Amino acid sequence: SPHAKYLRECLSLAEKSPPRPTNFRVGAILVSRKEGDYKTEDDRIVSTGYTMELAGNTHAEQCCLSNYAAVHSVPEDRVWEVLPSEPDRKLVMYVTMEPCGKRLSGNLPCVQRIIRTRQGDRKGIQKIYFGVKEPGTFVGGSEGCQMLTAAGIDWQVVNGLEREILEVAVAGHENREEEVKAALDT
Ligand SMILES: [Zn+2]
């Protein structure tokens, strides 16, 4: 019920990303939600991010977590130590596209950044919502979803925004419109 609204807010974040010929403009919002029969009024925003918000070749999930790490004065790879881990609440990430499980560079993929948050006595991110079951990379596929399931992280596709999410994501690409039509065909 609130999921489409959160993904529209994610799409507005994605539009802050600079269009480039090889990037995927994505936005992400991390939410703390009461477990069970929750009220969206009681949601708390924990962090936000978008592709290339931070210098270099950064993804939306990466920027979302690194923003929180910077505010809490820890290195980005130790953000798991400071993310909320409260009784009766769960961390939920909304992101326009499926988190990637493979990156064409040496950078850690987004699903691994998500899985990393569950360490020690910290619950980490418990569920991912996204609007297109394709990663924010050229690879395509569902490897991100498979890695989430293998790690015990829930995920759910929210239908109805696929074309708009893709049009924004690949706005900087030479063959963007033909590429959108192919992704919607998939
Ligand atoms: Zn990614």
User: Any binding-site annotation on 145?
Assistant: no
CA of 37 to the centre of ligand 1 (A): 31
How far apart are the C-alpha atoms of 163 and 30, rounded to whole Å?
23
CA of 73 to the centre of ligand 1 (A): 23
Exposed e or buried b per residue across 82-96, where buried means at least 16 C-beta atoms within 10 angstroms of its C-beta:
ebebeeebbbbbbbb
CA of 24 to the centre of ligand 1 (A): 9
Task: Write out the two tokens for 28.
Answer: 């992400």
Task: Write out the two tokens for 162.
Answer: 């696929």
How far apart are the C-alpha atoms of 171 and 168, rounded to whole Å?
5
Give the CA angle between residues 26, 89, 81 to the nearest 5°: 70
CA of 101 to the centre of ligand 1 (A): 7
Specified resolution (Å): 1.7
Q: How many residues does the chain have?
A: 186
User: Any binding-site annotation on 59?
Assistant: yes
The number of beta carbons lying within 10 Å of the beta carbon of residue 81 is 16
Q: How far is CA 128 from CA 50, 98, 148, 174, in A?
A: 16, 9, 9, 30
CA of 115 to the centre of ligand 1 (A): 13
User: Any binding-site annotation on 61?
Assistant: yes
The answer to whether 64 and 52 are in contact (CB under 8 A) is: no
* Domains in the chain: ranges and CATH: 2-185 (3.40.140.10)
How far apart are the C-alpha atoms of 179 and 166, rounded to whole Å?
9
User: Any binding-site annotation on 64?
Assistant: no
How far apart are the C-alpha atoms of 147 and 139, rounded to whole Å?
15
